[PDB]
Amino acid sequence: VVPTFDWKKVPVPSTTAKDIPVTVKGATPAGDLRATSGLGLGDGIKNHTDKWLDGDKKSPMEYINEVAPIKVKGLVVASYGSDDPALGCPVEYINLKGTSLENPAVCKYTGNRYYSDDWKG
Template sequence: MAMFGRKQGIAMATNFMKSLIIQRSSTLPSNTRCLSDAVSSEVITSHTAKWMQDTGKKSPMELINEVPPIKVEGRIVACEGDNDPALGHPIEFICLDLDEPAICKYCGLRYDTSNKSPMELISEVPPIKVEGRIVACEGDNDPALGHPIEFICLDLDEPAICKYCGLRYVQDHHH
């Protein structure tokens, strides 16, 4: 008896759903989305066509492409977009490639680093002249950067190179 009632309930629910689907499809055209009553699809279509026909205005991406790449030092940059956090641009950390500028996926800003490697930049620093035969290279003032004090012997006539930072030292023979 319970089985008969269950089958009848399923049949009633199925018929009810079919009637709702048929009723809804007859009142709405099948090729339009259900939009609010305040905006019709004709208004949206004409507005989009009007905006696309105006060739005097530049698109947002064309405006961003006019901004030259931002020169940065280092291999990683944090793009924050605009100063207004209400715009919804999250902070994106971008790893820079030496070949071409990196582009932020949220705002389209481009970031570029110099085309020289860190060792090429260090090699442009002229050798540092010192009076004594031994020099203590400290690298940076911050010991947390990993450069220990390196004592370098300057017995040769050619510059000696620090193995941690690449700075060159030469003995000044004029003293």
């Protein structure tokens, strides 16, 4: 009674299935759904940065990937994006428990990365 459904035998068109926008690690699990709008579809552009940057110029995402995560003592960190709090972003409180150098926590305003060796680990 109530037989299980086999999802693996469900057909998906190959044009649709190969065009899913997904994410690299960053602020999500790697490989989850990436939100997109219609801009760039007529020109065949499936990438975020290519929609406004032209050439082999260094992207902002490649700039922030070169800054290493920062070791912070404690359980919560406050992120302003600047030494002066008037000159940065609104303050962001980022959880640091469960974080390491390999899996750090990222600020949603600045893209800076933080971790703590204080959660008994």
